[PDB]
Amino acid sequence: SLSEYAFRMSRLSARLFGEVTRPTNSKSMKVVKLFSELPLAKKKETYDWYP
């Protein structure tokens, strides 16, 4: 898959840049993407749609 040195360096870079450190699958990255953005309902363009 990946060299051990490259994998450890990638994990270190992830820790330094604040990304997800633990190994996680695309299914569970949905949590990160959900919480990294406002809900569509919370967005002003939605709840402030009508004058």
Partner: protein, 101 residues
């Protein structure tokens, strides 16, 4: 004093969705991962289903803000095609001109 009852219903749906957005976000986050136990995910599923129907964001319909038209609405201006054409033709929308090329 909205244009019609459909617009009124949509306004209520938007208000309730805004009110329940955070709770739905958290519960859906619980449900949308393979990490937590599936029993916990199932109870989260029943909770999110037990939340009121109108809180569901998908039920929000983007209607024209001036004639409650449910289709042919330009999201950028929130106006149906008819109203947008009216304003653009009369020249009351800045920078919008007939396209010829």
């Amino acid at each position: 004093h909205y244009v019609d009852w459909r617009m009124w219903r949509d306004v209520k749906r938007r208000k309730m969705a805004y009110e329940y957005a955070d709770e739905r976000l958290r519960i859906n986050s619980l449900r949308k991962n393979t990490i937590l136990p599936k029993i916990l995910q199932d109870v989260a599923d029943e909770e999110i289903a037990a939340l009121p129907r109108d809180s569901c964001p998908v039920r929000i319909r983007n209607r024209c803000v001036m004639t409650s038209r449910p289709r042919g609405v330009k999201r950028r201006w929130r106006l149906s095609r008819i109203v947008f054409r009216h304003l653009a033709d009369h020249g009351q929308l800045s920078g919008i001109q007939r396209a010829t090329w």
